[PDB]
Design a protein around this ligand. Sequence first.
Ligand SMILES: CO[C@H]1O[C@H](CO)[C@@H](O)[C@H](O)[C@H]1O
Ligand SMILES: CO[C@H]1O[C@H](CO)[C@@H](O)[C@H](O)[C@H]1O
Ligand SMILES: CO[C@H]1O[C@H](CO)[C@@H](O)[C@H](O)[C@H]1O
Ligand SMILES: CO[C@H]1O[C@H](CO)[C@H](O)[C@H](O)[C@H]1O
Lengths: 133, 133, 133, 133, 16, 16, 18, 16
Amino acid sequence: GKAFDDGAFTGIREINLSYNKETAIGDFQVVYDLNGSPYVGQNHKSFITGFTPVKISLDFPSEYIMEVSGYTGNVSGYVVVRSLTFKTNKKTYGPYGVTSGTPFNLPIENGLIVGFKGSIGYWLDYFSMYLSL
Amino acid sequence: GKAFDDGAFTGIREINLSYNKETAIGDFQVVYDLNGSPYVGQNHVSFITGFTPVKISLDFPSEYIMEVSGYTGNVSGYVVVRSLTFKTNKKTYGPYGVTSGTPFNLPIENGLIVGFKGSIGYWLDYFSMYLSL
Amino acid sequence: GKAFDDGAFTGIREINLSYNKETAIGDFQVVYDLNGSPYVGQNHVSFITGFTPVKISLDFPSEYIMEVSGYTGNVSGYVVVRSLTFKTNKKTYGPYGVTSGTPFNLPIENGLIVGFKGSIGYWLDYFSMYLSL
Amino acid sequence: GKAFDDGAFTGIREINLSYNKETAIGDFQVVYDLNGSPYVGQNHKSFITGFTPVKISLDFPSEYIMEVSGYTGNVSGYVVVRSLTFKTNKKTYGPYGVTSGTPFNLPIENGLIVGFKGSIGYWLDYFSMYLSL
Amino acid sequence: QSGISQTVIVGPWGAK
Amino acid sequence: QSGISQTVIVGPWGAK
Amino acid sequence: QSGISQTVIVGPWGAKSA
Amino acid sequence: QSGISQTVIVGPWGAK
Ligand SMILES: CO[C@H]1O[C@H](CO)[C@@H](O)[C@H](O)[C@H]1O
Ligand SMILES: CO[C@H]1O[C@H](CO)[C@@H](O)[C@H](O)[C@H]1O
Ligand SMILES: CO[C@H]1O[C@H](CO)[C@@H](O)[C@H](O)[C@H]1O
Ligand SMILES: CO[C@H]1O[C@H](CO)[C@H](O)[C@H](O)[C@H]1O
């Protein structure tokens, strides 16, 4: 798929993603905080359509992500991210997508997620997260 | 179990752990690097014996851990870390233990693992890792 | 004067400032790098005019600041930053302004300047710098 | 002189230095904190004697250094650190040595000094500081 | 705030 | 802590 | 080094890259 | 990248 790298910012305000209950995660876009002001990251879209949009609006800065979890698995002969769940200090968002395959989870004891990078073809191939104090 | 927290150091030189092919991870001790000097961390021992010891000697500083993965599962009614695998930029060490239960994995694109904390009773109950540039 | 705080970024691409050789530093503005793309910082202007403009265009990312130095001292009754000099791994920019008073200097062996904050009235009252690896 | 590099630690608990009212700073030794435990750094001694010892015992961790200042100047043909002053959030220690020559000062708005490196012959030739969050 | 240096910490994995 | 990233800051130099 | 700031990066999860 | 952790270092002040 087409790789993307938003880079690192100072926080996260909103996450916009789409999924399909029969395949995997599709689109991914983030509204970051940049030194106190919102910064709209580029919209990284799937090569196809038919996904269900989801908007995760965080109550920045009192609310922040404490754990990210999901499932990766094979879809059409490709290994992709099939589901994502975002847990904050106030609420749990998700799971979004198909909770089938190999699970993964990243609990954060101290620190913050401040950026995302990855790749998207028909679906989100893989993703990584920038962490900072 | 009995909690422990080694804290953060400059890097990792050697890892000494023990396991049992029928249960889970037992003892855990790390030899860190402290500003160029080896620093022997406290040996965190299981309450019981019968484990198979393993010594992972890294070619510090050229060799370092890039991914830690394993499985957590139930053993005698206790949720513990049943298996651990350490992948460096040079080799893969493990898996050590039993790869049954729920997998987890922490790949690192940029940065280093510089410390460990957790708890050990009969087996390794849980653990966390310190990360730094 | 009026305080300002640009915050932290990815690096520095250009610095635009103004000064008067017989008084002190006036205007201050920075074009930062934000994850590979230019980000034009707010122009922090002096309350008065009559300053000499200076444009410091760095060969980002191969060129970066290694040392910032200058002088502080009175202009009328106010203590302000009278002069500044920027030394990179390729050239030395400055000094700009009155090179007399109390010197100060910040050499960096490891790390980078990724942001500025301070205060400007008729002249640059004071300033601080964000540092990161 | 003889170079030294203590490296980086978790914090600072005590600084031991010596000075001579007519020349400059001589001996330098630090008791660091290493993940909650005191760690005695190597004593970096001057090649000669005749200095007055000073012990700066900080109330770790509530008390920490907020600014380090001093003077550098020529002593018998050698440019050295002639004076040092340590200001914490609780009090000011110093100045120790000779307050003459070129001043320098490093105020910290956010962060901590976690280590020292430098060189000492008859006197402290130069020094640098490790900074971290 | 504190005179103690901090580090990013991830985990824990295992018993809650 | 809060949801805002931190950075080392040195200074200020100039007026108190 | 380079004039580009760096930060810890964990991942990736999904298709293998290394 | 090496297996050695890095930290910001400022200075030196004194002889060059
Ligand atoms: C068998 O019981 C012991 O071992 C388990 C698993 O290691 C711990 O959770 C427990 O606290 C300890 O007392
Ligand atoms: C002459 O007075 C003006 O300039 C000084 C120096 O910049 C500022 O400190 C002050 O607030 C502003 O009103
Ligand atoms: C007098 O000479 C000695 O002291 C000076 C100042 O400390 C050092 O620079 C020098 O290397 C050392 O040999
Ligand atoms: C159907 O192929 C497309 O989607 C997959 C899964 O997302 C991959 O990214 C692949 O490179 C891309 O061409």
